[PDB]
Design a binder for this molecule. Sequence first.
Ligand SMILES: Cc1cc2n3c(c[nH]c(=O)c13)CN(C(=O)c1cccc3ccccc13)c1ccc(CS(C)(=O)=O)cc1-2
Length: 111
Amino acid sequence: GSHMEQLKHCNGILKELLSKKHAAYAWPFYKPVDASALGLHDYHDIIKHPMDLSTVKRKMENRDYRDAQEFAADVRLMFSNCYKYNPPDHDVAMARKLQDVFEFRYAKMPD
Ligand SMILES: Cc1cc2n3c(c[nH]c(=O)c13)CN(C(=O)c1cccc3ccccc13)c1ccc(CS(C)(=O)=O)cc1-2
């Protein structure tokens, strides 16, 4: 799915993921994780490919994505980073709220 058509759909997803309707659970993913400031010990040992929505937006604005799948890969990388580093009952609950938005809207892509 290399179409612009599909990439436009992904672009609508990103803007919805950055909208104020989801800010309550989404804003921890707006910018890169500041592990050193937040005392996230070993964060960059355990997480070798950081990702966040500011990075996904840059890549989308620079038209660096070749198809929707690369897009999805990055968004799921961001969520996976969160699940891998944190315990199951870490306030991870915000990631699953946002991922439910992303996944349902990704599944609705034309094709
Ligand atoms: C992907 C991600 C983002 C954060 N992460 C944390 C643990 N593991 C993660 O994967 C993770 C630790 N973290 C918190 O625990 C936290 C404390 C106080 C209020 C919160 C409200 C919502 C979510 C987290 C917090 C905070 C704190 C602040 C920032 C924003 S910034 C520019 O300063 O880096 C990011 C995270």
